[PDB]
Amino acid sequence: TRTLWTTPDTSPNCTIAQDKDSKLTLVLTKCGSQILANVSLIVVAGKYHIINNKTNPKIKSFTIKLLFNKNGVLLDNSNLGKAYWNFRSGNSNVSTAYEKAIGFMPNLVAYPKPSNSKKYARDIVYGTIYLGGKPDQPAVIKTTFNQETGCEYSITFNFSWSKTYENVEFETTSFTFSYIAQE
Amino acid sequence: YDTRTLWTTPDTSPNCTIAQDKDSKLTLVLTKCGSQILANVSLIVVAGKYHIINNKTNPKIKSFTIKLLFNKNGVLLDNSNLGKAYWNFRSGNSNVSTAYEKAIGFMPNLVAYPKPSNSKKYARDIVYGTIYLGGKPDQPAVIKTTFNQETGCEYSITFNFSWSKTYENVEFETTSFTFSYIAQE
Amino acid sequence: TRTLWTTPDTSPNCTIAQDKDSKLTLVLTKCGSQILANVSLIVVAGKYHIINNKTNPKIKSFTIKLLFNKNGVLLDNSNLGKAYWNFRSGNSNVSTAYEKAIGFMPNLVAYPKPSNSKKYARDIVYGTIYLGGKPDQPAVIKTTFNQETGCEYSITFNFSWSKTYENVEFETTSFTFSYIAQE
Numbered sequence: 287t288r289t290l291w292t293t294p295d296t297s298p299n300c301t302i303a304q305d306k307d308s309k310l311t312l313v314l315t316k317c318g319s320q321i322l323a324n325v326s327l328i329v330v331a332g333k334y335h336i337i338n339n340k341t342n343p344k345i346k347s348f349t350i351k352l353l354f355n356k357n358g359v360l361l362d363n364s365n366l367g368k369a370y371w372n373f374r375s376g377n378s379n380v381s382t383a384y385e386k387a388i389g390f391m392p393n394l395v396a397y398p399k400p401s402n403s404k405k406y407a408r409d410i411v412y413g414t415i416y417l418g419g420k421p422d423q424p425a426v427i428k429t430t431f432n433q434e435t436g437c438e439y440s441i442t443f444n445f446s447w448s449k450t451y452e453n454v455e456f457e458t459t460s461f462t463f464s465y466i467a468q469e
Numbered sequence: 470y471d472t473r474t475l476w477t478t479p480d481t482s483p484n485c486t487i488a489q490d491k492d493s494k495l496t497l498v499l500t501k502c503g504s505q506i507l508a509n510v511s512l513i514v515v516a517g518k519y520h521i522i523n524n525k526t527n528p529k530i531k532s533f534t535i536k537l538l539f540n541k542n543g544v545l546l547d548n549s550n551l552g553k554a555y556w557n558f559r560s561g562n563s564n565v566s567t568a569y570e571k572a573i574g575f576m577p578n579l580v581a582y583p584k585p586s587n588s589k590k591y592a593r594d595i596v597y598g599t600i601y602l603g604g605k606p607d608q609p610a611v612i613k614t615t616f617n618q619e620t621g622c623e624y625s626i627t628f629n630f631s632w633s634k635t636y637e638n639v640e641f642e643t644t645s646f647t648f649s650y651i652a653q654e
Numbered sequence: 655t656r657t658l659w660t661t662p663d664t665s666p667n668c669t670i671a672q673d674k675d676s677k678l679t680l681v682l683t684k685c686g687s688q689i690l691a692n693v694s695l696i697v698v699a700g701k702y703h704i705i706n707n708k709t710n711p712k713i714k715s716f717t718i719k720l721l722f723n724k725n726g727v728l729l730d731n732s733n734l735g736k737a738y739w740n741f742r743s744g745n746s747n748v749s750t751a752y753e754k755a756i757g758f759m760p761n762l763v764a765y766p767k768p769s770n771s772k773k774y775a776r777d778i779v780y781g782t783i784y785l786g787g788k789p790d791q792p793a794v795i796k797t798t799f800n801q802e803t804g805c806e807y808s809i810t811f812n813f814s815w816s817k818t819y820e821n822v823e824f825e826t827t828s829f830t831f832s833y834i835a836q837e
């Protein structure tokens with residue numbers, strides 16, 4: 287129960303533009319009050335698989351959202367599929383879907399839901415990853431905690447780039463970050 | 470201090486003094502993962518000289534420092550910029566009710582990061598990161614964290630915030646950054 | 655056995671271009687399914703000790719390799735010397751070489767060895783460190799998992815820079831990252 291993850295294989299588990307067009311590899315490891323997170327993305331098909339901004343000047347970003355209920359269970363309207371998001375067992379998952387993962391949720395006092403109170407930037411982490419592992423192909427991964435509506439907690443990953451990439455496949459290096467846990 | 474968390478609490482009540490009393494909330498979370506401490510930090514400035522940055526009217530205002538000084542037992546000293554009242558081991562979204570007396574396992578390692586001396590000062594006692602003001606991607610600032618370089622204490626963690634862009638009336642409140650350091654014990 | 659490391663003093667323990675020309679400080683802490691890593695480097699002598707790209711325009715990168723066998727034991731072709739890598743015991747290392755550390759190896763499903771199949775970028779993490787701690791002296795540390803031959807697992811650090819440095823001592827700030835563990 288110390289690690290929630292997508293499993294480390296490369297089987298598509300995420301829908302960005304079309305069904306199962308990407309494998310989001312996400313590992314959440316609970317280190318007490320902080321969750322240590324490691325993430326990467328491989329797009330395998332669809333609109334975001336091969337980026338060509340000469341042809342499509344406007345395709346410059348996309349978002350992957352993980353929505354969770356009060357028990358920390360993933361809601362089906364998340365881009366990530368519920369099928370293989372579970373507690374780890376070896377290189378796979380436990381046989382049964384979990385019913386509670388509140389200790390992996392982002393803290394609501396640190397990262398409040400939208401309200402009419404002042405919105406602070408501490409609920410965002412910025413990182414840079416590299417497409418195809420090439421140092422001159424950076425893309426920004428912006429992670430935001432608890433800013434989606436229709437859920438009790440949320441983790442969203444926005445990927446964007448500013449260079450005019452020509453036939454660059456969207457598959458990334460890995461990024462680590464952490465966040466304060468709800469409990 | 471097996472896997473405990475030493476923190477500032479996650480609320481937004483000012484707990485730090487940069488230029489004037491209680492002008493900011495430093496949110497700092499230190500979690501012990503054996504020989505390394507996993508740290509998560511962000512800063513909200515609410516008043517004073519560093520609250521709203523205008524480098525067109527004040528081009529020389531480009532950096533400031535927040536210092537956490539600790540004694541031989543890992544206890545935070547009162548002359549640190551961070552206040553002592555809400556820096557303690559975590560209990561729910563708050564702190565345990567007794568001030569801690571020992572936290573040596575959360576201190577930066579003295580062999581990895583020696584106190585100042587006339588021996589060579591190696592760069593490994595610094596970690597650099599970039600955070601963003603207001604969560605805007607076009608508003609970077611550098612957070613430089615240095616271990617054990619202050620005097621008047623046994624251990625120290627110093628945060629230096631600086632920026633090179635010429636900001637015009639930009640509120641200094643930041644995104645979060647994670648780093649780790651080698652623990653003393 | 656929760657931390658494998660190099661002792662964080664300044665005694666040389668690594669051979670880049672000549673014997674014991676550097677001190678790699680590496681700490682690997684097992685946080686369950688993820689290893690939390692912290693690395694820095696001091697070059698004390700030889701070719702990479704003082705960088706002068708006016709004198710040597712093409713000296714712009716070097717690599718430090720850690721190669722491990724099936725039991726997670728460091729192999730002698732690694733740049734890091736075997737006498738310097740062991741589980742922590744206070745501020746030093748245990749007195750006898752360890753026999754197993756498979757739980758510290760980079761996961762082979764997440765990071766496969768080279769083969770005929772498509773190679774994904776998720777087996778790389780990029781970071782930037784700073785020479786002499788100066789903010790205007792960045793160098794890239796690229797860390798790759800399980801891409802070397804002659805071993806069962808590997809962690810390799812490639813240090814490179816794009817600026818023309820003139821008489822700059824190669825000793826760095828520290829970088830943290832994590833990776834998915836084998837067991």
Ligand SMILES: CC(=O)N[C@H]1[C@H]([C@H](O)[C@H](O)CO)O[C@@](OC[C@H]2O[C@@H](O)[C@H](O)[C@@H](O)[C@H]2O)(C(=O)O)C[C@@H]1O
Pocket residue numbers: 597599611633782789790791792
């Ligand atoms: C710690 C850090 O982030 N260092 C940066 C560094 C500093 O921001 C700068 O030296 C502070 O004055 O900048 C580096 O890039 C320089 C580069 O920055 C671009 O944004 C700008 O468009 C260029 O004109 C040029 O200034 C540097 O090498 O000094 C990068 C380094 O990582």
Ligand SMILES: CC(=O)N[C@H]1[C@H]([C@H](O)[C@H](O)CO)O[C@@](O[C@@H]2[C@@H](O)[C@H](O)O[C@H](CO)[C@@H]2O)(C(=O)O)C[C@@H]1O
Pocket residue numbers: 414416421422423424780781782794816
């Ligand atoms: C992994 C990394 O930090 N990548 C950098 C990248 C590399 O440092 C560089 O390409 C060598 O591999 O540099 C990036 O920035 C570039 C500058 O170094 C260069 O001076 O100017 C470029 C544009 O003219 C560019 O800005 C890059 O290639 O995009 C930034 C990237 O994070």
Ligand SMILES: CC(=O)N[C@H]1[C@H]([C@H](O)[C@H](O)CO)O[C@@](O[C@@H]2[C@@H](O)[C@H](O)O[C@H](CO)[C@@H]2O)(C(=O)O)C[C@@H]1O
Pocket residue numbers: 412414426447448601605606607608609
């Ligand atoms: C979150 C992050 O990486 N932010 C970058 C920022 C963004 O990449 C960019 O604003 C998105 O469009 O870019 C910064 O640097 C800019 C350069 O990428 C650009 O080519 O030139 C700009 C000046 O005209 C600027 O230098 C930025 O906006 O400051 C750097 C920042 O870290």
Ligand SMILES: [Zn+2]
Pocket residue numbers: 329330331335455
């Ligand atoms: Zn593809």
Ligand SMILES: [Zn+2]
Pocket residue numbers: 514515516520640
């Ligand atoms: Zn304000």
Ligand SMILES: [Zn+2]
Pocket residue numbers: 698703704
């Ligand atoms: Zn010398």
